[PDB]
């Protein structure tokens, strides 16, 4: 099939976006 | 210095593992507890 | 026949007593175990870990002999191992109706009469666990005993009994004595009320309801009976996406912790396989920010709840959070893991929790045994090669006078995990459809508090399912078919107990053959028979099977 | 029977009436009443903590005077609301917590009116910031200790979450007391006004800073710091040289450059930083 | 033009996962030296 090869890569940079916002939290938190 | 920082922090990899002390001297660390508390 | 065929169909009583037939013929399972797990007899938990285990190994097998060896060691422990001595005989006896009044005959609150009242008191509790999704005068036996009882002693079996009967079916009978069980001002009722309170609303939404639950917990100055709604708050919403998020920051924001901790739970079952991006940034944001332990537990154990579809994903997540600087954290990572990848024999969540099983905190070392229970039961060393290196480990850390209670509580409960129903039961939350399996994902959802009581995560029956594939041709009778298989053979292996004091790939089966759902593809059909399936064969469970 | 998850909720405010009388009259060991308000079978609640005065010198428990407390529990009560004696309480002064063989008699003479009074034990001098050592106690009835039963009866995997100290395991525990795990009980009624309350500069930052001497200050520094450069003009040239792990026992005689000299960076910046801006806020402001 | 319209997102996306994720490996293992540094 060729029409999931989009509609899962898109589905992971949903995935991916939340991680690198997410250790951006904890660059201060553990300072704290 | 940001640059200095930027392209810096490339080297930190493989840091393996942060050993809390051990598996066998806690045990025995919990074992010399409990003998100086029996005496 | 046609008229019949709503019987058969909508009471699906036809497939609890072939469940039943299919756990009364096949029972492969050891007496050995529970007498090498006998020789931790002391005043300790082991007493209600030793009830626990087997009750989880003989689910629906009616087989008492596991109990009916002795009685003294049995009824040794006291005020609440009776409570749940008398508890585990009911799962025992679970999705049967005969064997259920006549074998606790003797414990009936009115006849025997002896000091203990628990011990007669949680009979209800075991009678709710036999007919779950089941109602009938189970419901009005159980309605009718609660008008007129004790206190909060046969009142906790009682209620948590009747809201597990009539679990998610709306009923204004039970609503109305679990009204005056809730307004007892009392702390004992408290577990009593509020978990039963949710079950018998669940998926419901009914707005005044949630009124009353939480416009009750807010002035009581008992901690159980904020702690019973807290879950049952999370549980009367159930998979919406939307309609619970005026809710979600409604308790996020307040003061209380506890309740803070219910939100955790209710947008956890409002995304229940929702792989939705909202969701997850301020589920987890206020796993990083929030100054209370037990809401950080539960914030790191929604995860599974809401990404199992995927099992994939979260060893990629919450491999990261099993290095956090507190325990709690690093408990919570542990169980995310053993709610997730749970069906599977995954290989990348058991490398995580290989080292996790060594850290000096006890009770991270406890769940950390419990998610190495879940992630590979009925599976036999060629999935994974982990398995019988973990079965060792639990005999190493259970034999072990030095450790601790807790620790090793995590291993005799493996027993009866992993080795469940003579590995012929399993835990699926997930049917082939899609579609989610809710008494199995309720049931373990509450399997997590048994920090805060014991016999509450004796609610696990729920999550154990059959896998059988089973023929059936007319509507009662039996078929003779015998198929094979087709791929490598050793995958069929049994546990092949010790006692102590040139192969196949053409296996045959009779009609109830357990299969692991891995196995379905390996198998094959039967063409050679007199009998041919008119389905083709894709899932377990029962089939017609056309005889040609 | 007890269910090992008591939960003693106790306060704001009897804490710092618990510290400040454990510290004042520190060396010697003194003690006071718990006057909270008590509920159910698992719980209890100590809201307010009046202190007793002594007996005489020496370090004791010496013995409770009736006429004070008879005297005392009815003077609030005709002011404010009705409480009841819920526990006790002692300090050791820089021990830790366990009940000593004199404590635990005191504590005897008041579990026979309630069966629930709360061994309580402060100490005022380990406690630093996120520590305030604390550990209340109850005992438990040596009967069952001939018996060889085990008691409390654990329901619930709440009570073996904290661990003992192996010096507290020396003393009475495990044979004669337990643990009870505890919490606080806060609430923004007091959160609040406590927190803007503490730390609040009035008028500091809009300052100059002694205009003389911030620039005298900035040479004050940058003189020594000439010559700490010197150092760092010569540690950097003895490396490639015996394996800098040897750089780490060999310089724990004399001072090194690196750490030394990125300290007055710091230094030499929020102190000018600080001061440039605010003498440009006062142009504005001030005419 | 299912060659030129679908199989030119495939083109696309690949090129924003390719820094998005070496973002993320500089910045845990950056928390990853600070974590250890907790602990101890
Ligand atoms: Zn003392």
New binding site residues.
Partial sequence: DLYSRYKKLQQELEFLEVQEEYIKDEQKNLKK | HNMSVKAMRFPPKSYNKDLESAEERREREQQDLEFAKEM | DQTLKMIKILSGEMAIELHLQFLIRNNNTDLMILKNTKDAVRNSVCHTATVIANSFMHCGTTSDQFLRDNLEWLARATNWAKFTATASLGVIHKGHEKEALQLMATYLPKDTSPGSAYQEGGGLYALGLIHANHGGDIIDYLLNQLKNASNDIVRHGGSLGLGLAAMGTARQDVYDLLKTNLYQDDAVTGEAAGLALGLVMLGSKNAQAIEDMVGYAQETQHEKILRGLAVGIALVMYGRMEEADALIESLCRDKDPILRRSGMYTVAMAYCGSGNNKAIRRLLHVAVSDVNDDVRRAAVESLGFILFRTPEQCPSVVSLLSESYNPHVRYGAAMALGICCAGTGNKEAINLLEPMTNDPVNYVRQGALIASALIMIQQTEITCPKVNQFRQLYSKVINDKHDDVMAKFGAILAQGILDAGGHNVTISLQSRTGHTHMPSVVGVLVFTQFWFWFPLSHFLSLAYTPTCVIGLNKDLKMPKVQYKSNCKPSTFAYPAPLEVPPEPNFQLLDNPARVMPAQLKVLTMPETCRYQPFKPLSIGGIIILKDT | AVDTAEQVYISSLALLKMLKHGRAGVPM?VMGLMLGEFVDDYTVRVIDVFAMPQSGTGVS?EAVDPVFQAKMLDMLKQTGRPEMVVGWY?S?PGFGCWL?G??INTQQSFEALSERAVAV?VDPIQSVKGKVVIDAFRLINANMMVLGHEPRQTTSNLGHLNKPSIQALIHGLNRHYYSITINYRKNELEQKMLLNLHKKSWMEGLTLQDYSEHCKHNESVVKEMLELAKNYNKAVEEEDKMTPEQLAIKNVGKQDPKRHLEEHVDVLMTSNIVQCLAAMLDTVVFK | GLRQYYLSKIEELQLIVNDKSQNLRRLQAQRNELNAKVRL
Avoid: A, N, R
Wanted: charged share 25%; no cysteine.
């Fill in positions: 060991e428990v002692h050791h000593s004199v404590d034990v």
